[PDB]
Amino acid sequence: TPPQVLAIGFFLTIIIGAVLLMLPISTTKPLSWIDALFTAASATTVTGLAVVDTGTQFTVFGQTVIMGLIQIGGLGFMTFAVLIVMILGKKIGLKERMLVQEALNQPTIGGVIGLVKVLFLFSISIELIAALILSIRLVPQYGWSSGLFASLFHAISAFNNAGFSLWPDNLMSYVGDPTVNLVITFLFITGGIGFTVLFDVMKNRRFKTFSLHTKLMLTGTLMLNAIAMLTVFILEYSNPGTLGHLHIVDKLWASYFQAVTPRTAGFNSLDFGSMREGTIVFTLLLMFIGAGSASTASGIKLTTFIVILTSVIAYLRGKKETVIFRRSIKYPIIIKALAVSVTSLFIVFLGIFALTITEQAPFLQIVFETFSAFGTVGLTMGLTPELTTAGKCIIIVIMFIGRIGPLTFVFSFAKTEQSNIRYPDGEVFTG
Amino acid sequence: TPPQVLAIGFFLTIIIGAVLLMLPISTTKPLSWIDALFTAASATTVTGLAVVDTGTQFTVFGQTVIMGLIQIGGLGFMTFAVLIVMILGKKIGLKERMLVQEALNQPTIGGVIGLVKVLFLFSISIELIAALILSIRLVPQYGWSSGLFASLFHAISAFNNAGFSLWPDNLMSYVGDPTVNLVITFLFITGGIGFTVLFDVMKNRRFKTFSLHTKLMLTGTLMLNAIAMLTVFILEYSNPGTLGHLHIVDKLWASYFQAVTPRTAGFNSLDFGSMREGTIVFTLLLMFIGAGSASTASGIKLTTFIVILTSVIAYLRGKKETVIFRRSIKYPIIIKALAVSVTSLFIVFLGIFALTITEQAPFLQIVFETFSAFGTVGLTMGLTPELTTAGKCIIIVIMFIGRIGPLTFVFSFAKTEQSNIRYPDGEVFTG
Amino acid sequence: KQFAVIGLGRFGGSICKELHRMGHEVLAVDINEEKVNAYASYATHAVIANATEENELLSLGIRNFEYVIVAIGANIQASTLTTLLLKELDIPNIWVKAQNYYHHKVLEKIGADRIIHPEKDMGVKIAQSLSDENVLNYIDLSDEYSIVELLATRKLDSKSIIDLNVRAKYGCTILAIKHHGDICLSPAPEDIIREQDCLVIMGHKKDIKRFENEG
Amino acid sequence: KQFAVIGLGRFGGSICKELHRMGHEVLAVDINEEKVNAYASYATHAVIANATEENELLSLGIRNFEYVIVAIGANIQASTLTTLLLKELDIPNIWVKAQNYYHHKVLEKIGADRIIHPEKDMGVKIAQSLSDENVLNYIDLSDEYSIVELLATRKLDSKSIIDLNVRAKYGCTILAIKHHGDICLSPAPEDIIREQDCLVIMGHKKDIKRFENEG
Amino acid sequence: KQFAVIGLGRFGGSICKELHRMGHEVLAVDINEEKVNAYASYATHAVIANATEENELLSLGIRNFEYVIVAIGANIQASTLTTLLLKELDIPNIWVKAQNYYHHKVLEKIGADRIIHPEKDMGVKIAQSLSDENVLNYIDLSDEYSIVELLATRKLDSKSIIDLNVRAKYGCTILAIKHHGDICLSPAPEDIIREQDCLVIMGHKKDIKRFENEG
Ligand SMILES: Nc1ncnc2c1ncn2[C@@H]1O[C@H](COP(=O)(O)OP(=O)(O)OP(=O)(O)O)[C@@H](O)[C@H]1O
Ligand SMILES: Nc1ncnc2c1ncn2[C@@H]1O[C@H](COP(=O)(O)OP(=O)(O)OP(=O)(O)O)[C@@H](O)[C@H]1O
Ligand SMILES: Nc1ncnc2c1ncn2[C@@H]1O[C@H](COP(=O)(O)OP(=O)(O)OP(=O)(O)O)[C@@H](O)[C@H]1O
Ligand SMILES: [K+]
Ligand SMILES: [K+]
Ligand code: NA
Ligand code: NA
Structure with a gap:
């Protein structure tokens, strides 16, 4: 039932948001029922896939509804539910505390209500500061009416790993700008690193005092971004479409930006449709892995990928246990990572299989769209505007399962029956 | 060292076979050093990928070398090694018996020498019978000189899951022929079901007396071929290129043949280059799964796929153990299946990544070629003749690791150090 | 006829092997892991379970068996509690292996359809051959x-x-x-x-x- | 200075916590899983190992430690065998916690650099305060x-x-x-x-x- | 010649190390996990198995060994049941380490080809040197x-x-x-x-x- 409340509550925000975006006040042009549902779903799942342009289709009131859905979806449904109860004065019960444990993917209910207070106060604080830093650049270019709103929209979009942009070019006019690049990359890296990771750094200022999860996220993100930055820079250096007609300083900014944006923000500075096939293959893995178990990102998490990778290497080296940072990893941690990765690949495989039947598109664009939708990244190669009515409905299901997680989606409709009986061992050759 | 003998011995057969095919006696046309190495590697790994046509490039002596490499590679290097020692009169030692255990993927050395006697006698018996059955059809069409050799070549090719064909069209002229379809499909289904599975059926004539592995292979193959036959027939029914201009009887034969050929024979009756993208996606998952742990097939095995799939479903249903056919499955069986599947996907990912850098080809053909090469299936969409010199070298590595298995390849160069020390448990969130 | 044998001892394991030889569906239940692994091949279905637990007993589908044989004859608490559960579950035929005279009297009170003394009956027959x-x-x-x-x-x-x-x-x-x-x-x-x-x-x-x- | 403390008892765990407080690299070795989990945060590295085994001792890199403290004072066999291995591995400083007079004599023979009696020394100091x-x-x-x-x-x-x-x-x-x-x-x-x-x-x-x- | 040594004790482990030194194929079988890990490097093949089980004994390929040495001399039940299985499997040479006079008499009845008393023979030889x-x-x-x-x-x-x-x-x-x-x-x-x-x-x-x- 705690997984059932998450599934029902997260689905109701799509329906409420779809009605608000479909009103004539919130839009400048007539909008289809599927496009309103797709835009609402792409906001609460915080993916960023846009059939229609956000700046032109929606009004200022319509974009305010987008910011509400991004903020609600980015921080989670139960994060704001506790705040409403706390403001009204009602005390948080044991039943209400178990919902927070399931929503934040926590193993224990020890100090989980206080974590929500920290992460909500940190979210509004860092989005307000980043809007002020972006205000020094967006105001002389777009005045005071639009410059302040563009900074506020993008600070919320970047921190929550959304990738929504008001401009027709999604950050393609700020390739060489250090102000936009440094501030926005600081937002989704810190916003996607994990709320538990941020809380550990705030209370502990020394690296040796960090937990195993915090040390995995800090070292894992640094190593993964370094490999991605080298891969994009080497592969796309001679590409004429992207990273070719740019200065050496501008090549370093665009390579750094495209290394960190697939996990899982989905902003861009170069066109992904004109990149080589080698870089797209490496991004598929890149955006299949997210960042942080309790964060604004999705996909399989960075810690899930490291746990599985280390467990295999330990088996290949003959070791009897998985050891990272001189800490053993128990069997329940391994089997949970196994269930996340296998279920995620099965859903992605069904998404690619269903899209090839429906959509008439190149195969590389279909695979890129499904990995982007499931990981809630939002990067496109030119397929989302070309999707049919049946194709958009498949992506909405993919984005919904991707944000809520494959495990919590299955636990909604999979009743658990407890049986203490056991069975004799059977030998099966799995070579 | 038992994995090291397998890797060294299997690689030496490629070098010996490459020299024999490069002689002017064995070929009618000049052959490149890479094409001779590719053809030799595609035979001992029993894949069937052919840059040049087997019938035209090679003579009768050259095709006899192909049959030798298929038979040696199909049954394994150590299978014939025991026979040579037994013929010479030398007794099989404990050290020689441990090599057979590693080659056949057996858990114990109990009765493993006698299994080699059964599987070798069964192989020559069923290939001789099937050549006689094919002789009643191939002789009136190709005379006595070529009709007898065509039946002998194809019986060995089909049983060992090779897919090599002397004709320019790989079995595309026998779509509606029940004689060719039934006999050849009977060969690689029984030849790929597993040598341990065949030995259990021979000694036990009742299903309730079968082991867990035998019951998994018999029921798993029947269910997997039924789903594949329905999927190919439904998706390709309206396709004009394949299965469109055929009778209802001929549609049932071609749908049945294409359902069973990706695991892992690689014969065909319809052109895979003209199929829809939906069928190709289902075929990649189909040929990523092989058949039988100790057989002539490759890829991850059918039992590996079932063990992982049942382990996840048990976790999603809240069950504390993996139970198939009312038998519990221990943790060492699960982790071995986990290591096979993760290592296989990592090698396939590196193969697709390396081929996209080198080859200028459509992405669907690159993914299809890598899954076909790693699973040693040999199905093509039109890429193998178009591979460059660097592209062919990548496929040879992929075919080599795929046949020997990802685990036995890694164990060759991964030294095992035993440490009895343990570490304190660390908590890492893998949601 | 579907038979369930609870307790795979010398007496219980002999009933499992004999009924499986005759071609009958036998469920072998034991609390010991090694006993179940040994009799997995001699029974249609072998389960590691505690018969004194009602939740574990209902997980076996024990209501589908006409005959249940409780072959526990050294643990009176395990033997009497099992047949109390089976009587509550309305099993038509419950055959229990007893230990002594007092164990026989308890099982008669709580509704055991047939009570068996394997060693006591054989000892009387053996002593006739000695005399x-x-x-x-x-x-x-x-x-x-x-x-x-x-x-x-x-x-x-x-x-x-x-x-x-x-x-x-x-x-x-x-x-x-x-x-x-x-x-x-x-x-x-x-x-x-x-x-x-x-x-x-x-x-x-x-x-x-x-x-x-x-x- | 790198310190290794073998045996996380009342005496051994106090050396680990004090040396870690002063900012020293401490390796905490114990055969008990619960002891290592408790002192994982109070040591630079905590390993579950048996110190009487040479293969497990070499897996710790114990040759890289100048000071090894064997704080096992209730198992004479575990205490004397450990310091025999460390003496064979040429550890410059081996400090051993003894149990009685006879345990002190064995460790002196097999080359223990310093032998410590924690309860015996405190009991003498306490008895001076009582008198x-x-x-x-x-x-x-x-x-x-x-x-x-x-x-x-x-x-x-x-x-x-x-x-x-x-x-x-x-x-x-x-x-x-x-x-x-x-x-x-x-x-x-x-x-x-x-x-x-x-x-x-x-x-x-x-x-x-x-x-x-x-x- | 292929040798199998069952029971890696002080006597059994010495036969494994000596035969492996001479360049012989030795199978080391023991029920203890720690014993097998210690003698894994001193034997051609080391298996953790129970020799009293026929199914585990047949999984070792024990019929391929001309000499099997049962070096269990403190468990008479494990020693006599092992050599009963090996005699049933037609092993040409079974050498058993006995415990006392009564254990020697049982192994002679159930067909042990050679029965060895290691401590008894050494004690007689040592007592000659003392006298x-x-x-x-x-x-x-x-x-x-x-x-x-x-x-x-x-x-x-x-x-x-x-x-x-x-x-x-x-x-x-x-x-x-x-x-x-x-x-x-x-x-x-x-x-x-x-x-x-x-x-x-x-x-x-x-x-x-x-x-x-x-x-
Ligand atoms: N609660 C229980 N549920 C299921 N099996 C049980 C339970 N308690 C004991 N058993 C099993 O029942 C079997 C027979 O019981 P036990 O050995 O106590 O009786 P017994 O009279 O000595 O047996 P027998 O004379 O048939 O050898 C044993 O294998 C034991 O593990
Ligand atoms: N072989 C061994 N290797 C490593 N640690 C060991 C070994 N044997 C015992 N220990 C551990 O050493 C610690 C201290 O030993 P023990 O409790 O026997 O001594 P003690 O004199 O009673 O201890 P103290 O007075 O310091 O509490 C225990 O935590 C015990 O688990
Ligand atoms: N059933 C069994 N199968 C295999 N190994 C066994 C079995 N039972 C005991 N062993 C092993 O046999 C070895 C020797 O047996 P045990 O220690 O009982 O005899 P012992 O006469 O005291 O030995 P020794 O004098 O050679 O030290 C031990 O390592 C023990 O674990
Ligand atoms: K996003
Ligand atoms: K093949
Ligand atoms: Na009895
Ligand atoms: Na003390």
């Missing part, structure tokens, strides 16, 4: 009449059936004579009695003992 | 001279240092006086002695006892 | 004749072989003399006998004892 070495196997038709498979002595060699006045004097009827693996069913007068082989007789319990001593 | 309640803590400079931190009595209240003839009669030197958490280092004549607080004195062992009884 | 300190090592050719490697005394210093009338009076033959690590094979008369070194002699059992007492 008189002439007998080999006997079956008690009643408290006064029995069928005893005697062993031929040296004085009965080269003797005809009509010579033995069992029908007239002893009041006993000779049923069957077995000679060197060949069994003669209902012999007719007269047949020569060979050396020390089987000799089935029927009569009163006191009358057979007179035949052994006199002849 | 004379005027003392609080003492340190034995030699077998005849010691520094004793005395406790002020009621008769020493409102008394100056020059009034106390410790230097002339008793032959003892007053070292430091602590008043209500404030410590006076090397007081000069004369200072008024307050109520029952610390009073550090130095002199002969027999001479301090005369000062306690007379004053 | 007479002049002997160092002896080998019993029969019940009355033996070859004894004596130790030279102080009275035998600077004595020639011809001076010692062992051949005539004692009826014993001097076989070999070892001097400071140098061994003289079949010395010829006459050689000077040095200080307390080895002196191999051969003769009757009672005659050698006379030589020790007189000379």
